[PDB]
Every structure is written in C-alpha cells, then in structure tokens.
Scaffold this active site. Sequence first.
Site, PDB file in Angstrom:
ATOM      1  N   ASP A 104       0.917  -1.226  -0.048  1.00  0.00           N
ATOM      2  CA  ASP A 104       0.058   0.038  -0.075  1.00  0.00           C
ATOM      3  C   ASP A 104       0.863   1.406   0.037  1.00  0.00           C
ATOM      4  OD1 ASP A 104      -2.198  -1.905   0.526  1.00  0.00           O
ATOM      5  OD2 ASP A 104      -2.361  -1.212   2.697  1.00  0.00           O
ATOM      6  N   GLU A 135     -14.235  -0.275   4.270  1.00  0.00           N
ATOM      7  CA  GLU A 135     -14.566  -0.536   2.625  1.00  0.00           C
ATOM      8  C   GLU A 135     -15.926  -1.084   2.389  1.00  0.00           C
ATOM      9  OE1 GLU A 135     -10.859  -2.958   2.388  1.00  0.00           O
ATOM     10  OE2 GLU A 135      -9.855  -1.430   1.172  1.00  0.00           O
ATOM     11  N   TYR A 178      -9.108  -8.978  -2.624  1.00  0.00           N
ATOM     12  CA  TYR A 178     -10.008  -8.050  -3.368  1.00  0.00           C
ATOM     13  C   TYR A 178     -10.558  -8.418  -4.684  1.00  0.00           C
ATOM     14  CZ  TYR A 178      -8.506  -4.407   0.121  1.00  0.00           C
ATOM     15  OH  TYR A 178      -8.249  -3.433   1.087  1.00  0.00           O
TER      16      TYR A 178
END
Length: 659
Positions: A233, A502, A613
């Site tokens: 990230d 999220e 994801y």
Amino acid sequence: ETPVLEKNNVTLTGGGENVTKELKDKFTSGDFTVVIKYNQSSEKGLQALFGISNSKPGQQNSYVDVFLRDNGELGMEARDTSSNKNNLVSRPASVWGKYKQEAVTNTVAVVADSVKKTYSLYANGTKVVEKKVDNFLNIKDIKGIDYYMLGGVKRAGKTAFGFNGTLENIKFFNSALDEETVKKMTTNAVTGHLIYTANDTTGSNYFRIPVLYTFSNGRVFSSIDARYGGTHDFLNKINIATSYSDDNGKTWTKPKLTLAFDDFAPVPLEWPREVGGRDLQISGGATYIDSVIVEKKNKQVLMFADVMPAGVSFREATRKDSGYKQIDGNYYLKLRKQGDTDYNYTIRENGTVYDDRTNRPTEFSVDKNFGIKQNGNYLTVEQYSVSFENNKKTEYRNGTKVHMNIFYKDALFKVVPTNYIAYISSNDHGESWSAPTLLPPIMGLNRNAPYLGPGRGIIESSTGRILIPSYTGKESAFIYSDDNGASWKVKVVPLPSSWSAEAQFVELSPGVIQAYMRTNNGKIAYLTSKDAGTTWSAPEYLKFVSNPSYGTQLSIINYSQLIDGKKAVILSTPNSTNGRKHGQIWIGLINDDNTIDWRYHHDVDYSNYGYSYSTLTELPNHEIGLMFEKFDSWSRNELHMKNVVPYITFKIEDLKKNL
Ligand SMILES: CC(=O)N[C@H]1[C@H]([C@H](O)[C@H](O)CO)O[C@@](O)(C(=O)O)C[C@@H]1O
C-alpha cells in the site's frame, strides 16, 4: 532443441509411473528443463509432477522434483543427501485448481542452469520465480540417482508426494531452455484471463485493487492499482490503470495510465520476496490509490481515487488538517513554501497562488493537473528512477525533467502531508478524461479526507442521489451528491469499532439501500437506509461468512434479471478464518420485506486457494464478470507476485449452486 523424453495423456491416481529406462543418464550436462501440461483430479496433499531420485535406503534426501500444494503454490526441490544441500524454490499462487466445477489445465515448467546457478519456475506464461542459490545442484551433482518417475518421487523404495490427475503432456530436456521459449511453451487458456500483466503498457510488475463496471452503452470497463515497488500500500508508487472491452469481456484494450504522477518513472522493478527484503519500500512517489467508478444519469463517467503526496503513508497522514483554508467563505487548497513553517499560501481563482498574509496574488500559479508555474512558465524537477541489482535498491535522479507538482517532495510549494480524494470525468465512456478535481473538505477543515471503498458507486433510483462509499477508520463516510455531481456532501456514521470499512451499496427497493462492509471483527456488516442514505440503521451481520479480524474488501452488486422470481444481489468475498482464501460468490434474493435470502453460492476454486479484493459486474448479456486478487494480499508470504489478478466470466447457472 528437442526433448530427451515426451509423454502424453498419463492419468494417475497417486501411484506414479516409472520412466527410469527412458531417462536414465540422459542428463549429460546435469542441466534440465521440464515442461508439464497437467490437470489435477484432487488438489489435496503435496504432489510431485515428477521425481528424479536416489531411491535406495538412506538416500531419501537425494532428489529433484516439481511440486504443487493445495493452495496453488508451485515449487521445486533439489536435494543431495551426502553434501547436505537442500534447495527449495517456489512461489505461492502460481497455478489454478478448478474453474466452473472442472479441473483446470495448467502448463508449468522448471529450468535449472548450472552456469547461472539458478532455478526458474514458470506457470501459464509467467516466470513466477527465478532464484540463484549458492548450494546449487544439477542432476549430476546429486549422488546415485537411479529412479526417474512421473507423478511422484521414489524415496527409500516408496512413492512419495503422489500426483492425482492427468499429465496431458510432459517434456524433459537435458539443457536449460531460454526464458522466452519457456514462457511461450507455458502459455495457454489461463494466460488469457489476465487483463493487466507485468511490464505491459503500464510499466508495472504488480497490480492490486481491481474494479469492474459496465456502462449503459455495453462497454465493460476496468480500473486497477498499478503498484510499482511491489504490492505494498505504502510507501510506494501507485497509478490507476484502465482497460476496457467492447465485446462482453472477451478482448480488452492495452492498459493505459489514467491517474498517474510523474515524479517517479513507471518502471518494472524486481521486488525482493525474501524475509526481511520483502519489507523494503521506496522513499515514496506521489500516489493514486483505490479507485471507485460510477456512471451518471447523463452517461458521463466519474472515477474517484485517493491521492497521497510523495512520501506520505496512510499511517503517517495527519488526521487534523484537511489541507484547505476557508477565506471569505470559500475553500482553497493551502500551500507551504519551502523554508516556511506556516502555510502562508492558497490556490485561488484560475489557479493563482495568493499570499494569505497580504491577500494579494504571487508570481505563481497551479494548473488543473497540479503543476506549478512562475510568471506563466512551468517550473520543473528531475524525475526519479528506482533500480536493483546486487540485492541493493537505489533511487536516483534519472535525467528526465517533469513539471514541478504540489504533490511532489521536490516542490517549492507543497500541500499538507495528508490524504485527499480526486475525481475525473469522461464523456466518451473512458476513452478520454478531464483533469482531476480534489474534493472539498467535506469532513471539516480540521479533518483529513475519507478513504474510498474500492469498487463502484451507485445512483439511487427514486431521488437520483449519487453515493460514493468511503471510511475514516472509526466511521463510515457516505459521500453523496443531490445535484448530479456538481457538489458533494457526506453522511458520517460512527461504527462499533475501528473498522477499515470499505463498503459497497445495493438498492433493495426505491429509497432503500444497504451498505455492506469490511469490519475488524471477522464478519461482514450491513447498514440499512430507508431514506436514500440520509439516515442509517445500526449494523447487522451476515451469518455465513467468517473471516479473520483484519478482514477484506468485498464486492456486491444489483443484478438486473429475476432469479427464482425475485430481485437479486450478487456478493463476492473470501470466506475463511485462515487467510484471504476460499472465495465465494453468493446470490441473495430480495424478499418482499426487504430481507435477503442468501440461497446460493459458488466457490471460486478450491478452499485453500487465495482470494482477496474483488469486483463484480453484470455484463450486457447478463452474464457476470469477476476480477479478483487470486492470492492472499494480506499475508507477508504472498507479497510482490506477478500476474495474479485474473478476470473470469460466469453464467447465472454456474453460480446457482449449493441449495
Ligand atoms: C516441498 C516440501 O515441503 N518438502 C518437505 C517435506 C514435506 O513438507 C513433507 O514431506 C510433508 O509432505 O518434508 C521434508 O521433511 C521431507 O520430506 O524430507 C522436507 C521437505 O523439504
């Protein structure tokens, strides 16, 4: 260059096949290349596609093999008993198990090259790993090899690591074939499921955070993080790349860099995967991260992403400063000039930089793409490249001049080191895009911006309100516009704990929407609004998903066709307490009372395979597109891997399983 042995269609159920007569002493130099096109009938256990060994008692650590594990890891061993050299080279998430209830054909390979002292492994067109080892062993280096077998390794007269499946084609070469040859030989139907690939037109070796969206005109559009310095990230360089399909997902455009800074060159980097080395990060380039897409009523497309100045991490971003000032009721992005301690400047009308102490324009201005001009002329800075070689990371000014930008570490005027949100718009369905707009300080002047929930936004049908999911670390932040995206507001909803929330939305019925989201408690949460997002219920939780405390992003969408006479939603998430694994697609049927009957699910691959994801879309033909991280993107063991974000299509009948 031709094989010393080639065999076809060898079906095995753990017992192996002796090919000693047909390989004995044929490996003259000791080097080898073995190319194996196979499918597995069962993924359980450690399984060897072939084994070359000393089979005598006491010599059970004298062998070479290529192996598969039940989590998709591909590896090889090369071991010699009397020198006590034990080499193991592998990469997680290299192969596929099953797809739509059928075993997947993979093509893998191993190359051992004595001159380079390297072992290389290939899977489905990708060189998944090449590693130099000081204790290198070729076939000649291992003492008393006497047994060569398919689908196992003969150790002390017993078959170890028995393979279950079919070796469709296996070729043994007594030399190290070159990389391009072996990449071609391993290319197959699996290879064609990658939209983004290492060192394609993005220049990135790595990707994360895929998003799919189907536009009103039938175009299927994707975006993704192109993460250059491994899959971290932060700190990193990240751009948002895009690619689209006008034939229902069959063929895709060459990826383009759609949101990208140029303080750092977008280059392919060989990020280390060893313990220790894998924690390496670059000093940080200006970054776009975590995209969100929505199509407006008028067919204009918006894409949002988080924006991070160079060197600033989500973890060190200040939470107490928006990066804006309010002057005469207007919100202006503020700037600190190098050498000052205060932020004495603001970007006002036409990008003119004002000195706030005197309230007068300076010689400086900032264009719509954040570039700095002085007296109408662009200021420039030198771009950075990153490099490796001798296991040493180097960053350096690379001779390219780029525009000075307020997000860069070398800028004369700099923004607050915090996170922002930008959006761009397209009027031609993703072929070209406007300059970015930073969201105003909707959280307040003394708070940072929210973090986007990657995936899509929605338009609620009864009011036309546009909703964009985001989160703060302690709250949900539902960003919204009631004027067709001219201006933006937010509903901030405190959460039971510090969730990385999220989220994605679905509409159950007009005015009634649910936000499904990641938590820190192992469950998927959903909050309900009955006034198109103005007010929200307390959290409820899905009963059938149980994940680790860190959690994972999800995808949920509305589906346009009735299923069992009911309106349906489609959910994608991992479902495992052991990692980001066991991907499932769930069909939820909306009851008359607006509860959901989670009636069907389909497992994507075997349960120990990685699944992180993900993103769903309804294709124009009412099939389902899925793009996902086919690896555990949390695990410190699966960082920095190439070619692991595939795209697959499902018909509803492929999904209507398990009830
Ligand atoms: C690829 C791999 O993991 N190989 C290792 C195996 C397996 O873990 C076990 O046999 C369980 O199947 O165990 C060893 O102790 C062995 O057999 O000598 C070490 C070897 O390196």
